[PDB]
Amino acid sequence: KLALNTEFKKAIDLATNSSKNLFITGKAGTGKSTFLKYLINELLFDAVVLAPTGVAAINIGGETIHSFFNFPINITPDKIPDLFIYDYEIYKYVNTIIIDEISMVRADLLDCIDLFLKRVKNPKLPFGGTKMIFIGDLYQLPPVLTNHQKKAFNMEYESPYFFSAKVFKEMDMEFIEFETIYRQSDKLFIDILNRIRNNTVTDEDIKIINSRVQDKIDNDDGYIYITTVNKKAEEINNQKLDKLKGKLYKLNGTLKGNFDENSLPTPKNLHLKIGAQVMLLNNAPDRMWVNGTIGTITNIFPDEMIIELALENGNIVEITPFKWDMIKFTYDKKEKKMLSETIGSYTQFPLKLAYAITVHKSQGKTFHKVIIDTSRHFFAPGQFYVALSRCTSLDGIILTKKITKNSIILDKKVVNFLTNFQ
Numbered sequence: 001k002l003a004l005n006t007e008f009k010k011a012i013d014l015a016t017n018s019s020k021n022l023f024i025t026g027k028a029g030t031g032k033s034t035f036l037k038y039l040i041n042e043l044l045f046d047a048v049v050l051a052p053t054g055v056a057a058i059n060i061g062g063e064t065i066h067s068f069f070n071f072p073i074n075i076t077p078d079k080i081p082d083l084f085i086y087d088y089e090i091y092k093y094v095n096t097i098i099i100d101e102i103s104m105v106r107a108d109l110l111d112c113i114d115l116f117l118k119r120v121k122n123p124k125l126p127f128g129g130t131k132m133i134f135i136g137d138l139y140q141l142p143p144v145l146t147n148h149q150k151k152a153f154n155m156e157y158e159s160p161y162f163f164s165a166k167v168f169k170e171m172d173m174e175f176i177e178f179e180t181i182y183r184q185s186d187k188l189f190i191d192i193l194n195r196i197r198n199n200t201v202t203d204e205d206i207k208i209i210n211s212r213v214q215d216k217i218d219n220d221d222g223y224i225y226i227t228t229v230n231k232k233a234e235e236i237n238n239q240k241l242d243k244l245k246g247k248l249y250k251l252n253g254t255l256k257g258n259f260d261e262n263s264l265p266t267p268k269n270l271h272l273k274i275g276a277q278v279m280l281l282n283n284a285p286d287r288m289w290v291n292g293t294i295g296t297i298t299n300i301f302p303d304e305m306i307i308e309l310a311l312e313n314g315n316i317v318e319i320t321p322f323k324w325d326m327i328k329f330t331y332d333k334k335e336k337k338m339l340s341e342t343i344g345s346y347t348q349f350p351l352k353l354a355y356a357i358t359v360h361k362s363q364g365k366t367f368h369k370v371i372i373d374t375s376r377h378f379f380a381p382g383q384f385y386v387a388l389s390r391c392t393s394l395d396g397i398i399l400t401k402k403i404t405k406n407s408i409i410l411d412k413k414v415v416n417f418l419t420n421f422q
């Protein structure tokens with residue numbers, strides 16, 4: 001039911017017929033998710049799909065990288081050879097292994113997959129000779145810190161980011177980018193995002209971005225506070241909910257089978273009040289709401305199990321609990337095949353308090369009106385770009401504090417690596 005872009009048909013050809021080592025990239029919202037959705041279902045295809053984190057795998061209907069390869073948490077590329085492989089026969093059946101949100105996987109973690117695949121498969125070809133499709137826009141790099149949040153492995157890695165994987169320097173994968181925009185296609189905003197990606201920001205860009213700074217906000221309704229501090233975001237949602245009048249409703253999620261309670265999209269104990277600012281987590285088929293749409297609860301119906309909210313201006317919708325599937329790829333020793341099957345179900349309203357969110361937890365979502373916490377002196381490499389990528393237009397963006405071109409410093413380091421990808 002979707003249009004096939006000229007770069008969409010180029011990517012499905014190189015992946016479904018001339019399948020060899022492809023890399024889908026682009027900007028935030030350019031079609032990479034629907035391209036992967038169109039490959040697995042609504043098309044004749046079979047392949048494993050992996051994601052770095054458990055919550056990422058639940059959204060795309062895949063399974064964790066560590067879960068698929070039975071990797072321990074402490075796995076390093078040096079522990080791969082001294083790692084006893086059971087169920088060795090099953091790995092010779094998997095081809096075209098697709099990884100999603102590739103920018104989020106570590107450098108060492110990606111080389112573990114190569115060395116693991118080289119064991120169960122041809123030991124000379126990269127990744128054991130399996131077709132590697134990587135998706136997830138390239139400039140959504142995870143945040144790093146110098147004193148905090150390190151493991152500092154410096155054996156041969158220039159950086160913990162994905163591109164520093166040694167498998168790349170001995171591989172050819174003919175990268176393909178998705179450059180077509182949508183969804184509040186603010187061109188001036190898009191071009192500023194392009195120059196931040198290119199690290200070619202002009203002084204007029206900084207003047208335009210700083211024009212969105214506001215120390216005061218009248219009618220903050222509809223705005224979501226995007227910060228980096230996981231602590232601060234939780235305080236804002238809870239404080240905003242206490243200041244709301246009305247009965248507190250406690251809705252409980254049904255956890256069937258074997259599901260990871262540490263990867264729940266929305267809390268099992270959902271505390272909501274009529275009037276709360278909530279966020280939809282379901283990306284509806286009829287395009288009424290996307291994953292990240294902000295609404296306001298207008299009524300709660302516990303008996304009928306229906307939560308009513310006006311989606312913005314007046315787009316009133318009725319929401320029922322949604323079911324998430326826990327996908328696990330298993331080798332059927334009887335039918336000799338791999339096709340994926342659910343091991344657990346989590347059912348709960350696709351809703352979450354949306355007064356504030358963190359950059360890490362807002363992955364994949366785009367909002368309409370954001371309040372970005374730019375009180376930090378510096379932004380970790382590529383962390384300002386990901387904050388702006390969570391919004392759809394410059395008119396929706398509000399900055400708490402004015403930034404300078406020195407704030408986007410340490411982007412210079414990574415951009416010289418990302419340009420090497422040719």
Ligand SMILES: Nc1ncnc2c1ncn2[C@@H]1O[C@H](COP(=O)(O)OP(=O)(O)NP(=O)(O)O)[C@@H](O)[C@H]1O
Nearest residue numbers: 002003005027028029030031032033034035137182
């Ligand atoms: N080729 C296309 N033709 C028509 N509509 C499209 C196309 N690609 C994307 N869209 C629309 O734009 C939305 C964004 O694409 P989507 O595949 O969801 O990427 P995303 O998850 O929003 N973020 P990203 O993976 O960075 O692109 C989709 O939900 C569609 O509504």
